[PDB]
């Protein structure tokens, strides 16, 4: 119809074709390797989350969920977790424990500067009157507060 | 510190200080060209609060428009067309008299690496903002076309949406 469409239909140049149409094929899973391995490539995400023990939506389903077979005083209280209903959820949960196990050393050491910084304060103002040792300014060059001085005292221990 | 004091000195535009300045400034501006560069803003606090920062790539142009479409909205279309490469940020009233309105229009250089590398003014380098003074996407453009939230602020009527099963 159009001039631009029609001149290249008559010409001899090949058409810039793209065999892109793959209907009915879903998006292959990347990201978490565990779920990818247990991801059925044919089932829909609502079916696969359910088969894997995961909630696709914590919010109300707005429709009619499939029936494949004929199926027969508290603000202080805390919900004591939810046991995993599938092995695959336990696989995800087990990795969470191991990843936290590696990242367990959250205590930091001290560098040389703050090391001798805390010794100079400690050997002069004891070890208990942290407010008084924050009140001094001759040695408290940076003018730290009592709260941060105690943190350095704890961190220097280990 | 100062732009607090400059805020309330600009709130009184007929007081003697301002009126004496309105005559002095308008006389010398009319002596110039219609659209001319301005080194420092004639209102530093207003330019500041409208987005202008004293750094390279931020530009200001002063324009007078005959009184008698919005005048300020005009100042933006005329300045932008004059400086074809700069993107117009904003615009503000600086002065007026019996026969003219003097407007300053802030522009940004989309190519200057002080701007392109600025995380906050980067949004103006994107081509969707080409000549926002021309589409009505500036402040006065947003006002002059009645865009906003409120009850005081077409084809959805004429259409006949016939669903598939009707």
């Amino acid at each position: 119809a159009n001039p631009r469409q029609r001149n290249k239909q008559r010409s001899g140049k090949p058409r810039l074709t793209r065999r892109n149409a793959n209907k009915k094929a879903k998006a292959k899973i990347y990201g978490n390797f565990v779920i990818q391995q247990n991801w059925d490539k044919h089932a829909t995400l609502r079916q696969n989350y359910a088969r894997l023990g995961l909630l696709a939506t914590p919010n109300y389903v707005t429709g009619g969920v499939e029936k494949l077979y004929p199926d027969p005083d508290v603000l202080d209280k805390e919900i004591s977790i939810a046991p995993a209903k599938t092995e695959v959820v336990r696989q995800l949960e087990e990795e969470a424990v191991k990843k936290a196990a590696r990242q367990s050393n959250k205590m930091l050491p001290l560098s040389a500067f703050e090391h001798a910084y805390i010794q100079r304060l400690i050997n002069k103002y004891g070890t208990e009157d942290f407010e008084s040792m924050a009140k001094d300014v001759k040695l408290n060059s940076k003018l730290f507060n009592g709260s941060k001085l105690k943190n350095l005292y704890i961190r220097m221990k280990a | 510190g100062a732009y607090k004091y400059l805020e309330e000195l600009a709130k009184k535009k007929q007081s003697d200080v301002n009126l004496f300045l309105s005559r002095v400034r308008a006389w010398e501006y009319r002596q110039m060209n219609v659209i001319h560069r301005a080194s420092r803003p004639s209102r530093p606090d207003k330019a500041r609060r409208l987005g202008y920062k004293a750094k390279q790539g931020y530009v200001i142009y002063r324009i007078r428009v005959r009184r008698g479409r919005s005048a300020r909205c005009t100042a933006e279309e005329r300045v932008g067309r004059y400086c074809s490469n700069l993107r117009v940020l904003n615009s503000y009233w600086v002065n007026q008299d019996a026969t003219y309105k003097f407007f300053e229009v802030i522009l940004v250089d989309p190519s200057h690496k002080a701007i392109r590398r600025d995380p906050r003014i980067n949004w103006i380098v994107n081509p969707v903002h080409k000549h926002r003074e021309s589409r009505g996407l500036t402040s006065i453009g947003k006002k002059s076309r009645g865009i906003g939230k409120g009850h005081r602020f077409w084809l959805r009527h004429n259409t006949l949406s016939l669903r598939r099963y009707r």
Partner: protein
Amino acid sequence: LKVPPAIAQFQKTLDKNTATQVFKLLNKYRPETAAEKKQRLVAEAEAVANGKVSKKPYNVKYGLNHVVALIEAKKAKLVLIASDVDPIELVVFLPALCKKMGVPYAIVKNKARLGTVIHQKTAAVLAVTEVREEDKNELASIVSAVDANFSAKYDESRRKWGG
């Protein structure tokens, strides 16, 4: 033409003799140029790197917002205002605020002179707050000199419609 008294002040600037005496004192407390500040810092960086208490800096305070807030705190001992600021709107309130807070002040000639004090092209206002004890008695002289050549002198001329 007739001029409001708010702008008429800036015509009656500080005298030639006193302005030089202000700048002679100020020149002792110029801010460190960015060059030697890099050299001064690198001396401490080298001291930290190989292995290792200072004192408060003493300079003049500059910047329109910086100086206004020093006055509003009454931390300014002396304010110096350039008589030829481009939009005069910037300092037309400064003599009012400087009188309201009891801060002695003087309108000095040219802004480039003040800029040279602070290693800048142009300085719209300078303020002296802290002065070393050596020159404490010296500063009180100019404050009296400003109070004698700017507050005692003029005063009434500050209120007349200029031009």
